[PDB]
Structure formats: structure tokens, C-alpha cells
């Protein structure tokens, strides 16, 4: 099955809809979704983040498309988007927290 059939891919949604869906109080740290860009073209990894000196917020990470490949920073490259999701769901590796649960619809 294609990576777009996956429950964490929300396709074309706004930055507000992303943040409203993720900022449910019933979601743990590390709730995330992959969406299409709105401002900019590349895909976006949208994660919920609890900062002790700020509160509960949403961070947005741009998933740039390698012309060769996907990455958020040029230091960690993945051959597929599912291989990017699977890695960060195990290691923060520069994220505020590791990805734990797929965001509910």
C-alpha cells in the first residue's frame, strides 16, 4: 500500500487545521502528522510539543525533496517518507520530542 494511504498523512490541510487537530488536549507529546505545504511547496511535518516555559505548541518542520530523498536537515536523509517517519518516531535527533502517536482525525 502506498505511503499516502497511511493515517498520519493528512494531505492538503491548512496550517490552522493542522494545529487545531494536533492541539487536542487528549493527545500525548509526540503527536504528529505529515501534510502538504500551504505557504511553501514542500511537505511539512507538524508535531505537538510541550515546552515547560511556554506550554503546549505546534512545531512545523519542512520536509525538503532531495533531487536525487527526503530530509528535514541535510544531515539525515531518507529514501522514502515512511522511512523518515519511522526514524523520528524512535529518535528525537534534533526534534523537541520523538514521534509517539499518529494524530486522530
Amino acid at each position: 500500500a502506498p505511503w499516502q494511504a497511511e493515517e498520519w498523512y493528512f494531505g492538503k490541510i491548512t496550517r490552522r487545521e493542522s494545529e487545531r487537530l494536533l492541539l487536542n488536549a487528549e493527545n500525548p507529546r509526540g503527536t504528529f502528522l505529515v501534510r502538504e505545504g500551504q505557504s511553501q511547496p514542500d511537505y511539512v511535518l507538524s508535531v505537538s510539543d510541550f515546552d515547560n516555559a511556554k506550554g503546549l505548541n505546534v512545531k512545523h518542520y519542512i520536509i525538503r525533496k532531495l533531487d536525487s530523498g527526503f530530509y528535514i536537515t541535510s544531515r539525515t536523509q531518507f529514501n522514502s517518507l515512511q522511512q523518515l517517519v519511522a526514524y523520528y518516531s524512535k529518535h528525537a535527533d534534533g526534534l523537541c520530542h520523538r514521534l509517539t502517536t499518529v494524530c486522530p482525525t
Binding site: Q38, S39, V44, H60, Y61, I62, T73, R75
Partner: peptide, 7 residues
């Protein structure tokens, strides 16, 4: 204009 995060 919107803010994204750079690792």
C-alpha cells in the same frame, strides 16, 4: 511569513 523549525 509563517514560522518553521530548522534542525
Amino acid at each position: 511569513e509563517p514560522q518553521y523549525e530548522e534542525i
